[PDB]
Structure 1
Amino acid sequence: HHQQEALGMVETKGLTAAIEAADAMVASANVMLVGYEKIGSGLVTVIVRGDVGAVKAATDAGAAAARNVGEVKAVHVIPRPHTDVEKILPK
């Protein structure tokens, strides 16, 4: 249907919660895992991409699953243009 493409984040304090978030996200929606990002202070960000509806569903599931394992610091969905979707991401 070529709907809006989104970028999805679940940020946790602790890696185990982040791994669970990543697993739960690809388990629920048609999203693909972009990868992990570490910024120190135990903060780990899990990033996925896909349709906004799928990403919103994924990040909701990922956050929910991660909260049963550890601490979730941030959950957000960023709608993106169909080209250069991952351009905004850090190298």
Structure 2
Amino acid sequence: EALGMVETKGLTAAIEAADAMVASANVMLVGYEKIGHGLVTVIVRGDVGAVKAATDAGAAAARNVGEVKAVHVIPRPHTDVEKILP
């Protein structure tokens, strides 16, 4: 499964990002992470294509509410990565 991230400045934009992403059935919300400086990351998993479309939609929705700081898809995460994940 692929990993998708949308990172915003502001939690309100992050929640909007999350809601837009989980709107399609084959995308799973992994969780939120806060790292300070107002930066909040929403993490999802699913088929690569679904995650690409999802993160694009999440960034698109979020940018109307607040600031998008990063948008990224990892099609094939290496397995150790699952330890830093929520």
TM-score of the superposed pair, with normalisation by structure 2: 0.89
Q: How far 1:56 moved relative to its partner?
A: 0.1
Aligned to 1:80, which of 72, 76, 79? 76
Greater gyration radius = 1
> Does structure 2 conserve the Cα–Cα contact (< 8 Å) formed by 1:24 and 1:61?
yes
> Does structure 1 conserve the Cα–Cα contact (< 8 Å) formed by 2:3 and 2:77?
no
Instruction: State the superposition RMSD in angstroms.
Output: 2.0
Q: Percent identity between the aligned chains?
A: 99
Which segments of 5 or more consecutive residues in structure 1 lack a partner in the other structure? none
Q: How far 1:61 moved relative to its partner?
A: 0.3
Describe the SS at the equivalent of 1:22.
helix
Which segments of 5 or more consecutive residues in structure 2 lack a partner in the other structure? none
TM-score of the superposed pair, with normalisation by structure 1: 0.84
> Does structure 2 conserve the Cα–Cα contact (< 8 Å) formed by 1:11 and 1:72?
yes
> Does structure 2 conserve the Cα–Cα contact (< 8 Å) formed by 1:29 and 1:58?
no
Other-structure match for 2:63: 67
